[PDB]
Design an enzyme around this catalytic site. Structure first.
Site, mmCIF file in Angstrom:
data_model
loop_
_atom_site.group_PDB
_atom_site.id
_atom_site.type_symbol
_atom_site.label_atom_id
_atom_site.label_comp_id
_atom_site.label_asym_id
_atom_site.label_seq_id
_atom_site.Cartn_x
_atom_site.Cartn_y
_atom_site.Cartn_z
ATOM 1 N N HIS A 108 0.806 -1.215 0.000
ATOM 2 C CA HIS A 108 0.000 0.000 0.000
ATOM 3 C C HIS A 108 0.844 1.271 0.000
ATOM 4 O O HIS A 108 0.302 2.361 0.214
ATOM 5 C CB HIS A 108 -0.957 -0.006 1.196
ATOM 6 N N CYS A 163 4.369 1.822 9.248
ATOM 7 C CA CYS A 163 4.296 0.619 8.433
ATOM 8 C C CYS A 163 5.670 0.270 7.865
ATOM 9 O O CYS A 163 6.551 1.122 7.717
ATOM 10 C CB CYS A 163 3.287 0.786 7.297
ATOM 11 N N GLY A 184 3.114 6.509 9.801
ATOM 12 C CA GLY A 184 4.417 6.262 9.221
ATOM 13 C C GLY A 184 5.141 5.047 9.754
ATOM 14 O O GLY A 184 6.309 4.841 9.407
HETATM 15 C C1 LIG Z 1 0.500 2.258 7.279
HETATM 16 C C2 LIG Z 1 1.051 3.444 6.492
HETATM 17 C C3 LIG Z 1 2.318 3.998 7.076
HETATM 18 O O1 LIG Z 1 2.633 3.850 8.228
HETATM 19 O O2 LIG Z 1 3.085 4.658 6.197
HETATM 20 C C4 LIG Z 1 2.583 4.814 4.848
HETATM 21 C C5 LIG Z 1 -0.851 2.530 7.942
HETATM 22 C C6 LIG Z 1 -0.779 3.543 9.084
HETATM 23 C C7 LIG Z 1 -0.281 3.021 10.432
HETATM 24 C C8 LIG Z 1 -0.907 1.720 10.937
HETATM 25 C C9 LIG Z 1 -0.826 1.873 12.445
HETATM 26 N N1 LIG Z 1 -0.937 3.313 12.625
HETATM 27 C C10 LIG Z 1 -0.644 4.008 11.531
HETATM 28 O O3 LIG Z 1 -0.664 5.243 11.416
HETATM 29 N N2 LIG Z 1 -1.828 3.017 6.963
HETATM 30 C C11 LIG Z 1 -3.033 2.507 6.676
HETATM 31 O O4 LIG Z 1 -3.821 3.072 5.914
HETATM 32 C C12 LIG Z 1 -3.409 1.166 7.311
HETATM 33 C C13 LIG Z 1 -4.450 0.415 6.473
HETATM 34 C C14 LIG Z 1 -3.929 -0.292 5.224
HETATM 35 C C15 LIG Z 1 -3.722 0.621 4.022
HETATM 36 C C16 LIG Z 1 -2.657 -1.055 5.548
HETATM 37 N N3 LIG Z 1 -3.851 1.314 8.684
HETATM 38 C C17 LIG Z 1 -4.988 1.945 9.030
HETATM 39 O O5 LIG Z 1 -5.845 2.338 8.259
HETATM 40 O O6 LIG Z 1 -5.012 2.158 10.364
HETATM 41 C C18 LIG Z 1 -6.117 2.951 10.861
HETATM 42 C C19 LIG Z 1 -5.480 3.949 11.781
HETATM 43 C C20 LIG Z 1 -5.829 4.010 13.118
HETATM 44 C C21 LIG Z 1 -5.227 4.933 13.959
HETATM 45 C C22 LIG Z 1 -4.272 5.794 13.471
HETATM 46 C C23 LIG Z 1 -3.914 5.739 12.145
HETATM 47 C C24 LIG Z 1 -4.515 4.816 11.302
#
Ligand SMILES: *[C@H](CC(=O)OC)[C@@H](C[C@@H]1CCNC1=O)NC(=O)[C@H](CC(C)C)NC(=O)OCc1ccccc1
Ligand SMILES: *[C@H](CC(=O)OC)[C@@H](C[C@@H]1CCNC1=O)NC(=O)[C@H](CC(C)C)NC(=O)OCc1ccccc1
EC number: 3.4.19.12
Lengths: 306, 306
Positions: free
Chosen positions: A41, A145, A143
């Site tokens: 992603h 991931c 950030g």
């Molecule tokens: C990964 C993206 C990243 O870190 O760098 C591009 C995640 C965000 C992380 C996961 C844990 N907390 C984060 O900020 N991005 C996402 O969109 C994912 C979903 C899929 C695309 C993998 N995670 C997500 O949507 O988490 C929801 C969330 C809850 C609380 C705070 C932030 C995000």
């Protein structure tokens, strides 16, 4: 003596963390040999993550659309491929700091160390357990991931986790290093439910054996029980059923402390039926389940790594 | 989101850990520049440690009586000197993996990361707090001396602890990197008592602010109080007195969550007078005091290190 939750030394993993950028999305990557691993992603915008078609999205991407940074030096990407939910970026330089490594898929209840990273730079390390519902309770901001979970035998790093999601419940989900998610989760920003979270029974018993070793004794009672009787009470409190296998791994701690596993199960039986009465065990006012039977022996025998 | 106790990445400290042998005693050493630091009781036998005269014991020792091993390579010792309770071994080779480092003496209540080592090889890493009675609650088996505690700003390693003793109570005592013990402790196997262990009040309040950030809300009450009134109840439960300074460091978390410090002090006041009622905060059934106001901001702002 003393007992604390302990993470593996993260030095060998730090040398494999790079920053991966695609478009305006930046996350962490794992640089082993001449391949960089990162969540797929990275090719997604904030709007893409609502309902992404990763195939159609990856069609538009080329090798030069991937910026891989190792501190201040860049890795020239010469190939890319999507394996499940992970992206494999082929670079022209082998990582000179690649340790002996493996890719493993852990079982529920097993623990590992998480090196939390942002922009490819490490931030902290902590011990996590894969809950029976295939989630983890970690610490992941924006950030985070691409951060990985791992175990070390002596000089061999066993990579087992890569972080992707935070569920609406606040817990976290991810994949192995082959892109396969742990549990029934998909990398898409949509409401997703894990099952009922149960307690790793063999882990609480191992943690009670550690308290017994470290002078915590008040919980030790005088009853015994059977495997089925204890499981009838374990299932009442959402505990995992204890099998004859679990008794065998606990043998080391049972044969050293001289308390039979069924005896410890009876002391745990009353600890569920009577609570802690405002007392603590190893400095905790509840039953810890994030210590495998190998984690206690690791802290009582004193194993090291090179 | 999520909140866990997190240790710094130990990669920079791993490169400075060597094995120091003298006679039949083996412990860990800290190899920075061309100097190896290690506890001075490496010159002690098991019988010497009952009542050691370190001066008279060091008289008999020479440079060749010190074997410093870095994995499989040896460091030729060309000089030695006793600074307080630490030994400074001068070697003929500067450590090529020496990070930017400092020697600091932390204050009570501040935290640091401990890299547990045996035979100069790292075993695990965990976060420790210097209790107000200048002890720590860690995990130290036989051979764990010489292990160090540290903090990192960005590329600067701030060494602050070196391990020596386990008291009869099971807690641990040590020195700074200048050989000066934390507390009224001396490196001798004799009964030694620390004072009454009190609770770091500013740390529990910072940990309550983190729970507020991470959705844990039930504890938030409706009272307020004053600095003296809260301290009258804090002293009742063996809590450290909250000063106007402590209110200033908590300002960041107070100004972000919008809860005044005196308001959080009132929610903590009732949490002491009424208990937890069988509930948990951030997954713990008691009040955590090993999180400094900078440790929560570190986990909520997402600082990194290089
Ligand atoms: C990964 C993206 C990243 O870190 O760098 C591009 C995640 C965000 C992380 C996961 C844990 N907390 C984060 O900020 N991005 C996402 O969109 C994912 C979903 C899929 C695309 C993998 N995670 C997500 O949507 O988490 C929801 C969330 C809850 C609380 C705070 C932030 C995000
Ligand atoms: C340091 C020696 C070492 O590790 O290698 C030579 C300590 C032993 C450590 C301290 C924590 N647990 C250990 O095993 N050796 C000691 O003799 C010191 C006292 C002074 C000489 C510094 N610690 C001590 O006596 O601890 C008592 C103890 C309690 C429980 C288990 C072992 C020792």
């Amino acid at each position: 003596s003393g007992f604390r939750k302990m993470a593996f030394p993260s030095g060998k993993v730090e040398g494999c963390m790079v920053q991966v950028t695609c478009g305006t999305t930046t996350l962490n990557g794992l640089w082993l040999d001449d391949v960089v691993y990162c969540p797929r992603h990275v090719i997604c915008t904030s709007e893409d993550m609502l309902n992404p078609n990763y195939e159609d999205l990856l069609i538009r991407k080329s090798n030069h659309n991937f910026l891989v940074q190792a501190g201040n030096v860049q890795l020239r990407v010469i190939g890319h491929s999507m394996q499940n939910c992970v992206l494999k970026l082929k670079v022209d330089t082998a990582n000179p700091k690649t340790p002996k490594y493996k890719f493993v898929r852990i079982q529920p209840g097993q623990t590992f160390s998480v090196l939390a990273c942002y922009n490819g730079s490490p931030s902290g390390v902590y011990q996590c357990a894969m809950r029976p519902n295939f989630t983890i309770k970690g610490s992941f901001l924006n950030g985070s991931c691409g951060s990985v979970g791992f175990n070390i035998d002596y000089d061999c790093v066993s990579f087992c986790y890569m972080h992707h999601m935070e569920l609406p419940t606040g817990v976290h989900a991810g994949t192995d290093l082959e892109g396969n998610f742990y549990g029934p989760f998909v990398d898409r920003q949509t409401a997703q439910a894990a099952g009922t979270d149960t307690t790793i029974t063999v882990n609480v018993l191992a943690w009670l054996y550690a308290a017994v070793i470290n002078g915590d004794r008040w919980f030790l009672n005088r009853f015994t029980t059977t495997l089925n009787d204890f499981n009838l009470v374990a299932m009442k409190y959402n505990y995992e059923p204890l099998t004859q296998d679990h008794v065998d791994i606990l043998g080391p701690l049972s044969a050293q402390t001289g308390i039979a596993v069924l005896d410890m199960c009876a002391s745990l039986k009353e600890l569920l039926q009577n609570g802690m009465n405002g007392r603590t065990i190893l400095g905790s006012a509840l039953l810890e389940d994030e210590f495998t039977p190998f984690d206690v022996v690791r802290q009582c025998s004193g194993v090291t790594f090179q």
